Ligand binder design. Structure first.
Ligand SMILES: [Mg+2]
Ligand SMILES: [Mg+2]
Ligand SMILES: [Mg+2]
Ligand SMILES: [Mg+2]
Ligand SMILES: [Mg+2]
Ligand SMILES: [Mg+2]
Ligand SMILES: [Mg+2]
Ligand SMILES: [Mg+2]
Ligand SMILES: [Mg+2]
Ligand SMILES: [Mg+2]
Ligand SMILES: [Mg+2]
Ligand SMILES: [Mg+2]
Ligand SMILES: [Mg+2]
Ligand SMILES: [Mg+2]
Ligand SMILES: [Mg+2]
Ligand SMILES: [Mg+2]
Ligand SMILES: [Mg+2]
Ligand SMILES: [Mg+2]
Ligand SMILES: [Mg+2]
Ligand SMILES: [Mg+2]
Ligand SMILES: [Mg+2]
Ligand SMILES: [Mg+2]
Ligand SMILES: [Mg+2]
Ligand SMILES: [Mg+2]
Ligand SMILES: [Mg+2]
Ligand SMILES: [Mg+2]
Ligand SMILES: [Mg+2]
Ligand SMILES: [Mg+2]
Ligand SMILES: [Mg+2]
Ligand SMILES: [Mg+2]
Ligand SMILES: [Mg+2]
Ligand SMILES: [Mg+2]
Ligand SMILES: [Mg+2]
Lengths: 55, 98, 54, 116, 42
RNA sequence: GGGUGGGGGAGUGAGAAUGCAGGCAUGAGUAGCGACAAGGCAAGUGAGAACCUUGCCCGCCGAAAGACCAAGGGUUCCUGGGCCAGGCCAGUCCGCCCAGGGUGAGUCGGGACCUAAGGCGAGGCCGACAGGCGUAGUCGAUGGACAACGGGUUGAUAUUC
RNA sequence: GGGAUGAGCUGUGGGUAGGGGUGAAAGGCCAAUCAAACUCCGUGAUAGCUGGUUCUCCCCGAAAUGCAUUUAGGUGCAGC
């Protein structure tokens, strides 16, 4: 995106900020011993990257 | 009031197996699900003016399908496989040459 | 044994921060005129062309 | 050779015997094998000793090799080509090269092959 | 290690079926009350 | 959609009930990933392969872990697709998802034949009512009687074609 | 480890139902529940017992004693 949309130089790009936030969580069931039922969480992420051009 | 032989036979069956049996001169029809073999044989003879050696039948249940949250079922059907006498005129299905 | 109390934020974070990936070191390789970087243990494979740089 | 220190490959040691023999057969048949690094490191001296028997090349050596290998085609090719090819080299008939690990279990991989 | 439910369609019908429910006034009331509640199956 | 004032009326105020519902933490990137038969190499496919396909080695069962039924299940069978859910990992694979196709009987297993235990039971007897029991009768196989064998063929049926 | 031609084991079909059944008898079993099953209704059973009871400020401010009690961890009257 930086090189195409912004017309920047790829050799100057540095990963300025990057982080991973939480997405929605799906819930499942794992059967355990003696009629117990435990919950299993399927987590997802939102990953955000901001590259910037600087000498 | 009056009975017509054409109310028993609904449609031909169009498939690879059916096309394979056309080469043998055996025809497959969907019949009304409460008819019997003798009735189907009489009806075919009357309609297509042809000799019939034997008629075989089979029921088939409908498939279950789910659309939004719960299953739904298709209709059950009864197929009739009709083999002609050895030397009778072929039946022209008018669009099923095989 | 069961945990008697829930851990405070500070105590949870002290132990949680020590779970981390170790970073491997990369050295330069010139194969087929192009320059790449591979871990030093894969130098022979890179020079013989057994490494797939995708 | 020197026995394994620690748990054997593939479970028991009756399995390790077969693993080593199969790896040796494949190596002599193809000249080059890709496998996990521990298996290749365990294979190296095992295969070098068979090559030494083939270099000696008598009927007793052939019987001794047939003790471990079961593929007569590979025995024949080892006694006809690999032995005479290495007649002028004093050990070090194989070479191990490390490769990128594989997905699934991140097992380290290596290739073992004869020198030429 | 045998469990309580051993399916058998003929026995299920002969023990809980429509013709059995309709043979006694208690079963007739059961069918009527399931109708009143609006059940799919009686 | 609100403010202020005179009045009127309240499902009018929560921190606690091992309270109820929903979302989310701590334990914690921890336990576990379900038999003590065992996997490996080469090639392929593919964006991606420990697990999919092909070949060859190796190993296990073999009074079964092989081959047929009954009950039960209900399309899970075959072909062509699919790959964000599921499969205790991954998956290009699948008993998962989508579409289409697929089950052919005078003789096989049942009915249209027979009855057993038992059930229902015209009249009937008994019982304040509700109802109980039962004759004639009629149902009720797990039993009796009664006619087919061998080969071939499809991706999927075959003592059925 | 016990029995393994017997008072055997087992399939299919049937019968006995709650103060009732069945029991080579242990109060055992009768759908993971049995010194009287389960469901719905009476029903929002009752509990001298345990718990809970939600905004504010101003004034005053105790008792844990007597008598009686199928009473003594409850209540009535007095005292405060
Ligand atoms: Mg269970
Ligand atoms: Mg009409
Ligand atoms: Mg025929
Ligand atoms: Mg039929
Ligand atoms: Mg489907
Ligand atoms: Mg040792
Ligand atoms: Mg291990
Ligand atoms: Mg042994
Ligand atoms: Mg307001
Ligand atoms: Mg007002
Ligand atoms: Mg309120
Ligand atoms: Mg609150
Ligand atoms: Mg609370
Ligand atoms: Mg711990
Ligand atoms: Mg573990
Ligand atoms: Mg497993
Ligand atoms: Mg490969
Ligand atoms: Mg399949
Ligand atoms: Mg998937
Ligand atoms: Mg997965
Ligand atoms: Mg009467
Ligand atoms: Mg009666
Ligand atoms: Mg009778
Ligand atoms: Mg009958
Ligand atoms: Mg029978
Ligand atoms: Mg088949
Ligand atoms: Mg019964
Ligand atoms: Mg006692
Ligand atoms: Mg019980
Ligand atoms: Mg009772
Ligand atoms: Mg009682
Ligand atoms: Mg009352
Ligand atoms: Mg004061």
């Amino acid at each position: 995106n930086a090189q195409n949309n912004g017309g920047l130089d790829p050799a100057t790009l540095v990963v300025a900020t990057v982080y991973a936030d939480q997405g929605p969580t799906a819930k499942r069931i794992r059967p355990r011993a003696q009629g117990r039922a435990f919950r299993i969480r399927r987590r997802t992420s939102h990953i955000t990257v901001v590259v910037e051009s600087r000498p | 009031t009056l009975a017509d032989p054409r109310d028993i036979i609904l449609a031909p069956v169009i498939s690879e197996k059916s096309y394979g049996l056309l080469d043998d001169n055996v025809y497959t029809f969907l019949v009304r699900p409460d008819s019997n073999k003798t009735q189907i044989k009489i009806a075919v003879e009357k309609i297509f003016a042809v000799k019939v050696a034997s008629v075989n039948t089979a029921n088939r249940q409908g498939k279950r399908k789910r659309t939004r949250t719960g299953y739904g079922k298709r209709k059950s059907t009864k197929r009739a496989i009709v083999t002609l006498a050895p030397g009778s005129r072929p039946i022209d299905l008018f669009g099923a040459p095989a | 044994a069961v945990p008697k109390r829930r851990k405070s934020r500070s105590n949870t974070r002290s132990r949680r921060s020590q779970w981390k990936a170790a970073k491997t070191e990369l050295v330069g390789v010139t194969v087929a005129g192009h320059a790449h970087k591979v871990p030093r243990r894969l130098l022979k494979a890179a020079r013989l062309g057994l490494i797939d740089f995708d | 050779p020197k026995p394994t220190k620690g748990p054997r490959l593939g479970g028991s040691s009756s399995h390790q015997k077969a693993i080593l023999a199969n790896l040796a057969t494949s190596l002599f048949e193809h000249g080059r094998i890709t496998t996990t690094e521990p298996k290749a490191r365990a294979l190296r001296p095992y295969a070098e000793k068979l090559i030494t028997h083939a270099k000696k090349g008598a009927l007793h050596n052939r019987r001794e090799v047939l003790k471990k290998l079961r593929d007569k085609d590979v025995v024949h090719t080892l006694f006809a080509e690999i032995g005479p090819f290495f007649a002028d080299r004093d050990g070090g008939y194989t070479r191990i090269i490390k490769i990128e690990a594989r997905k699934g279990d991140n097992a380290p991989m290596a290739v073992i092959e004869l020198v030429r | 290690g045998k469990r309580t439910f051993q399916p058998n369609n003929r026995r299920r019908a002969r023990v809980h079926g429509f013709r059995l429910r309709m043979r006694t006034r208690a079963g007739r009331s059961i069918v009527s009350s399931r109708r009143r509640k609006g059940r799919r199956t009686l």
